[PDB]
């Protein structure tokens, strides 16, 4: 939950606010790592693989 | 018209928002 991202009352939408996946860089994100991973990897095969729904 | 048409089609002017999909509030 992030109460600063509360969509206004003038937004109908379907139920969510599917945004540009490249918009993740402007939001807070939990910094969870994998305590067992020897070497992990992101994926950007056409562009960076990320979702961002803002209910 | 000069070759700054790339600025009136994209980038610095025309308000092209590269984060909003085409046909926003429309078909897929």
């Amino acid at each position, epitope marked *: 939950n992030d109460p600063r991202l509360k969509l206004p009352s003038d937004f*109908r*939408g*379907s*139920d969510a606010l599917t945004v540009d996946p490249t918009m993740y860089k402007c939001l807070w994100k939990p910094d969870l790592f994998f305590a067992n991973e020897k070497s992990a990897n992101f994926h950007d095969v056409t562009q960076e693989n990320i979702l961002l729904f803002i209910f | 018209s000069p070759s700054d048409f790339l600025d009136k089609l994209m980038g610095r002017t025309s308000g092209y928002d590269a984060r909003i999909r085409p046909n926003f*509030k*429309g*078909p*897929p």
Partner: antibody, heavy 115, light 102 residues
Framework: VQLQQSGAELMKPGAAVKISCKATGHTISRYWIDWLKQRPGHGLEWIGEILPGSGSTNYNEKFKGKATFTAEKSSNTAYMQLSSLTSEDSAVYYC???????????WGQGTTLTV | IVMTQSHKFMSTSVGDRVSITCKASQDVSTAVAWYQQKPGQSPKLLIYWASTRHTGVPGRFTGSGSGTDYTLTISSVQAEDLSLYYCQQHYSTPRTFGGGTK
């Protein structure tokens, strides 16, 4: 791809019935299985959806609690349970499925319910 | 969203052009599907996204309209086109249909 439901059902008030949706042609944990309600006199109505593998469900706000979606990968079938049956529940219940969108292009033969 | 069909029953002769209006409640602008349910069978899909056809549908069914006001269209009504026609929005989560037209 095909969806083979159970047979007709007859229940009494206060009871609860469970309607199945036997997916014959694909793994049940593959696609969303939607559930609809057709009450005569009125029109169709969307109950909800269940992805039979991840146990995720998105019920309609009118059918919260009234309907419960479950799945069982042992036989590739998606279930729905109607609790607190009343005379308003007299209708036909379908289990649609939309593959390439939020439309309903795969349907079930129907399961008549009569409280 | 509250999809609406203001004509429960329509009259048409074999070989006519009839338009079925499904006036949406808010702006979906493409999210509309049209179903046909003969008596005693599941409603089969005809149109989705208000202008596309389903695999195995006759070419006389044509969807149109956008925004709020939508419309189905049958160019040459055959004998099998005497059934119930449901419109359906697939834009939001609660997927109302809109009653039905006959």
């Amino acid at each position: 791809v095909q969806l083979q439901q159970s047979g007709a059902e007859l229940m009494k008030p206060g009871a609860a019935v469970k309607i199945s949706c036997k997916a014959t042609g694909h793994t049940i944990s593959r696609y969303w299985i939607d559930w609809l309600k057709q009450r005569p006199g009125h029109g169709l109505e969307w109950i909800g959806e269940i992805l039979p593998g991840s146990g995720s469900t998105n019920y309609n706000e009118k059918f919260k609690g009234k309907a419960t979606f479950t799945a069982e990968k042992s036989s590739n079938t998606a279930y729905m349970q109607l609790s607190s049956l009343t005379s308003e529940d007299s209708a036909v219940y379908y289990c649609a499925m939309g593959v390439r969108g939020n439309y309903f292009d795969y349907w079930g033969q129907g399961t008549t319910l009569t409280v | 969203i509250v999809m609406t069909q203001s004509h429960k029953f329509m009259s048409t002769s074999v070989g006519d052009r009839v338009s079925i209006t499904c006036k949406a409640s808010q702006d979906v602008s493409t999210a509309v599907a049209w179903y046909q349910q003969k008596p005693g069978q599941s409603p089969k899909l005809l149109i989705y996204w208000a202008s596309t056809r389903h695999t195995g549908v006759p070419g006389r069914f044509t969807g149109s309209g956008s925004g709020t006001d939508y419309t189905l269209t049958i160019s040459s009504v055959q004998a099998e086109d005497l059934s119930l026609y449901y419109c359906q929005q697939h834009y939001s989560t609660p997927r109302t249909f809109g009653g039905g037209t006959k």
